[PDB]
Write a protein that binds this ligand. Structure first.
Ligand code: MG
Ligand code: MG
Ligand code: MG
Ligand code: MG
Ligand code: MG
Ligand code: MG
Ligand code: MG
Ligand code: MG
Ligand code: MG
Ligand code: MG
Ligand code: MG
Ligand code: MG
Ligand code: MG
Ligand code: MG
Ligand code: MG
Ligand code: MG
Ligand code: MG
Ligand code: MG
Ligand code: MG
Ligand code: MG
Ligand code: MG
Ligand code: MG
Ligand code: MG
Ligand code: MG
Ligand code: MG
Ligand code: MG
Ligand code: MG
Ligand code: MG
Ligand code: MG
Lengths: 23, 208, 96, 137, 86, 116, 71
RNA sequence: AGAGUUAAAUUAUAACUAAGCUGUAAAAAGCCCUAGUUAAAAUAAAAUAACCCACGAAAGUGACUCUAAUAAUCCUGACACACGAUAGCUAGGACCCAAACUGGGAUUAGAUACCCCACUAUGCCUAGCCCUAAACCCAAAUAGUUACAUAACAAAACUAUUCGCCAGAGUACUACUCGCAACUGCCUAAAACUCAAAGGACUUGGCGGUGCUUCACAUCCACCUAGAGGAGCCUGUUCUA
């Protein structure tokens, strides 16, 4: 329900961390 | 089911109706039977008041029957009984006084003893657990064990004979072999008991 | 019940004692009204759902020449009169 | 008839004998009942091992030996090997909570052996070592 | 371990009937929660899971207690009714 | 006695921190639950194992042991009679308590009031 | 309540286990349930009273607790 | 916060005894320097009480003993000052047991997962960092009222004094800045551009490899009988023609 927002942020952060690792 | 649930099954026994005066609870019982204005199913064509008919012989007869033939199956039953009789007379007159006291010439008591010897004690049911099918030992009801006995008899004496050999011959052979416990039918019952012991732990899977 | 407090004389050891001065003052006016209604020829209905005094009340109303509903009250009885009771009807001018 | 559930303390004068022996002199049957297996060992009161029987010793295998039937079989086998060394009575000590608890006990009874007291000593930490993690994360 | 053996969690069999003795024992252990605790300690339960379990159990107990109380309070009125077909 | 409800739940007035977090509100319902049917387990397993030991010893001749076979049969008959006759009496008699239906009717006669 | 007297204390202990009974069993004011508990723990570690069972000597003392094991 | 202590486990380690032990829905792998019983330090963790509701500002705190000790004659208040779960970092010490990682074993179409075994960082102690949590009781602090009064749901509705915050959704716990023992960090926090919605509660359905009851009467399983699927033909489809 509200989890949809949390899911967006979750994904963003994950992606970003992965990115920092690569870069 | 052309009979409503109102219809009771008939009691064909003559001895029950002939000698009523010595029993109170049964007098009261069949008093309540007829006086209830209870409808009775018409007595079957197979069943008679005959003093000569064995319900077990009749069941085995039915179980032999292929198609609609009561005639041919009653024929093969009659012939098998006669064949057991004469086989035991041939065994009787070639023997000595001791073995003439021992040997049984009644094809009826040989039938009943062969089937009592051939009936299994315990059985196997498949049970699904964790996506696998395990064969589990199950205690059996009486009727199931009688059935299994008869069906095993007819199965073997249908299947394993040479095509030249007639049915009453093979059946009398196996009746007399299962009387003495040495027949392949009792070997089947033993395969069942050994497969029931091999799996005995799995008896916990049974929830009833 | 919260609205009952102005009618209470007080509470004696956990039991609530109704002030009977006010009870008399009220019952006076109630009986006054009820009689005036019966005088002007109008329908009085005795309603109670309690099963002890059901019979007693039905008896009472029969003996006043008045009507009594002591039974299960059917849902649309007063609101939808014409369907439950009939094509056109008169409704009780007072209910007790 | 006055019967106490509680056992006979050693320093007490209490007189009860099973084949003439004090409660303390009776051999002890240790039954370790664990979810995958049941082990039984009958021992002297002096802690000298008399008899050992397990569900593995009894010729079962992996899953099978968990069951109560196997526990009973091991109990019978144990009671046989023990009566062979001539123990009439025994005090049962049950260690563990599993499928083979009661089965192994009455399998000792069935194996021609007499049980007098039945004790439960199951490890119960008052919080020692942290146990392994829960299944199905 | 350092305590004296055989004094605790021990039941003496009466008249040779073992099943009843074991039953008495199991009832004892269940009474003191020892069984639930043996079972719960097979796997570690993380402190928050524990906290949750305790809170739920207490709520459950409150509800059950209160329901049983209204039951026994109301039990009198299960008698055959006086006013039938009134 | 009932465990105290004072200061347990999270409320605007309450000084301290929650003890109980109720999943669903604590209010007495006007009905009870339906009794949970007992989980069945295997029956006659003991007499079976006895009989199977008998067989393994005597080489599966039935004539050898007539006692264990007969007692396993007897036990299975008592298990059938159990299954049939216990269903009805367990479904009716609750002993000291009442069947859930009568309990529910009773409760509906004296309902919980959340409202007003 | 004194840690030194093991009798009064072991009244509130389960004979078979050595557990401490709760309020619903002993039936005490919170104050005294607390007191009994703290006392029991102290007496247990100071070496006055055994932890894993009730001391046999005190078995036949008056039973004040509401629990019934044997039925 | 110090210092001292240990009941229940558990283990090094022997002594007997047994060939297996462990492990799952089921097995395999692992181990037989194994297992059961009898002995036992260290380490770590603190059954029951607790159906209690205390202490602390919060984080937190529930084995025992003692020492020290819980600001303000009590309004609000920062970016200043001092703290701050778990994880993590540096250095030294500990290591029972647990366990990211990793390696084996199963599972599976695959299985870099769920399940099994082994073992590590790590959890512990000392000292120093790091300063984040769904750090949420998603309900600010201090005084009050139960008057007016139900969006919905939830923990009923409100006054007064304050401080902190909030101006559609994404982009974004992002880029660029300042500061910071942090250098894959924290903090502070945009815009281009994209969209016409994004959201919160509910209603009735449908569905659920969700739970509890009750069933299936040729009907699911258990079970009975005869057939089909293999042969030849008959006849119909599909292709190819
Ligand atoms: Mg995104
Ligand atoms: Mg998770
Ligand atoms: Mg506080
Ligand atoms: Mg909720
Ligand atoms: Mg320190
Ligand atoms: Mg120790
Ligand atoms: Mg060491
Ligand atoms: Mg292997
Ligand atoms: Mg402790
Ligand atoms: Mg202060
Ligand atoms: Mg201030
Ligand atoms: Mg920190
Ligand atoms: Mg280090
Ligand atoms: Mg390590
Ligand atoms: Mg491990
Ligand atoms: Mg792997
Ligand atoms: Mg650390
Ligand atoms: Mg928190
Ligand atoms: Mg917040
Ligand atoms: Mg503030
Ligand atoms: Mg924007
Ligand atoms: Mg963050
Ligand atoms: Mg950033
Ligand atoms: Mg900038
Ligand atoms: Mg069908
Ligand atoms: Mg055909
Ligand atoms: Mg075919
Ligand atoms: Mg064909
Ligand atoms: Mg066509």
């Amino acid at each position: 329900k509200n989890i949809l927002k949390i899911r967006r942020r979750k994904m963003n952060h994950h992606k970003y961390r992965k990115l920092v690792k690569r870069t | 089911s052309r009979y409503g649930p109102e219809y009771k099954d008939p009691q064909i026994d003559k001895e029950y109706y002939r000698k009523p005066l010595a029993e109170q609870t049964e007098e009261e019982k069949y008093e309540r039977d007829f006086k209830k204005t209870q409808l009775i199913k018409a007595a079957p064509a197979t069943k008679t008041s005959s003093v000569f008919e064995d319900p077990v012989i009749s069941k085995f007869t039915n179980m032999m029957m292929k198609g609609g033939n009561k005639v041919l199956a009653r024929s093969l039953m009659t012939q098998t009984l006669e064949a057991v009789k004469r086989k035991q007379f041939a065994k009787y007159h070639a023997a000595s006084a001791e073995e003439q006291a021992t040997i049984e010439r009644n094809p009826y008591t040989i039938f009943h003893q062969a089937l009592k010897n051939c009936e299994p004690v315990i059985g196997l049911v498949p049970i699904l657990k964790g996506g696998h099918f395990y064969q589990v030992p199950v205690p059996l009801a009486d009727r199931r064990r009688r059935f299994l006995a008869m069906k095993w008899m007819i199965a073997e004496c249908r299947e394993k004979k040479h095509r030249r050999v007639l049915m009453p011959e093979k059946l009398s052979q196996e009746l007399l072999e299962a009387f003495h416990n040495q027949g392949p039918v009792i070997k089947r019952k033993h395969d069942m008991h050994k497969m029931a012991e091999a799996n005995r732990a799995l008896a916990h899977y049974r929830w009833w | 019940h919260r609205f009952m407090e102005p009618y209470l004389f007080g509470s004696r050891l956990g039991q609530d004692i109704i002030d009977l001065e006010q009870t008399a003052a009220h019952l006076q006016l109630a009986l006054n009204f009820t009689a005036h209604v019966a005088y002007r020829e109008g329908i009085i209905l005795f309603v109670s759902r309690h099963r002890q005094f059901a019979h007693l009340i039905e008896t009472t109303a029969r003996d006043c020449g008045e009507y009594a509903h002591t039974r299960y009250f059917k849902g649309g009885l007063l609101t939808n009169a014409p369907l439950l009771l009939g094509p056109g009807v008169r409704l009780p001018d007072l209910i007790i | 008839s006055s019967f106490s559930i509680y056992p006979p303390i050693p320093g007490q004068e209490n007189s009860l004998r099973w084949a003439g022996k004090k409660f303390e002199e009776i051999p002890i049957a240790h039954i370790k009942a664990s979810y995958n297996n049941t082990q039984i060992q009958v021992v002297s009161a002096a802690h000298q091992p008399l008899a050992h029987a397990s569900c593995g010793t009894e010729g079962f295998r992996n899953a099978k030996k968990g069951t109560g039937i196997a526990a009973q079989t091991a109990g019978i086998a144990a009671a046989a090997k023990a009566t062979g060394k001539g123990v009439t009575h025994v005090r049962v000590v049950v260690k563990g909570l599993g499928p083979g608890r009661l089965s192994a006990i009455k399998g000792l009874t069935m194996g021609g052996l007499e049980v007098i007291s039945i004790t439960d000593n199951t490890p119960i930490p008052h919080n020692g070592c942290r146990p392994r993690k829960a299944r199905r994360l | 371990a350092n305590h004296l053996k055989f004094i605790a969690r021990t039941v003496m069999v009466q008249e040779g009937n073992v099943e009843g003795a074991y039953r008495t024992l199991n009832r004892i252990l269940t009474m003191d929660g020892l069984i639930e605790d043996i079972k719960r300690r097979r796997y570690y339960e993380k402190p928050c899971r524990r906290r949750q379990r305790e809170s739920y159990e207490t709520c459950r107990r409150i509800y059950n207690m209160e329901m049983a109380r209204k039951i026994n309070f109301l039990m009198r009125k299960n008698r055959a009714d006086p006013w039938q077909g009134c | 006695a009932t465990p105290s409800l004072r200061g347990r739940l999270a409320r605007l007035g309450n000084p301290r921190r929650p003890i109980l977090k109720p999943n669903k509100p604590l209010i007495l319902a006007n009905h009870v639950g339906e009794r949970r049917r007992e989980k069945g387990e295997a029956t006659c397993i003991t007499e079976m194992s006895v009989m199977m030991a008998c067989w393994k010893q005597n080489e599966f001749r039935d004539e050898a042991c007539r006692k264990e076979i007969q007692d396993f049969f007897d036990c299975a008959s008592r298990a059938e009679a159990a299954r049939k006759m216990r269903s009805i009496q367990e479904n009716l008699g609750e002993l000291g308590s009442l069947p859930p239906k009568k309990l529910n009717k009773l409760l509906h006669r004296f309902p919980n009031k959340p409202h007003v | 309540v004194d840690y030194k007297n093991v009798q009064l204390l072991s009244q509130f202990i389960s004979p078979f286990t050595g557990c401490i009974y709760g309020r619903h069993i002993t039936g005490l004011c919170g104050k005294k349930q607390k007191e009994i508990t703290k006392a029991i723990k102290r007496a247990q570690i100071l070496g006055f009273m055994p932890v894993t069972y009730k001391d046999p000597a005190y078995l036949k003392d008056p039973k004040v607790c509401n629990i019934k094991y044997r039925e």
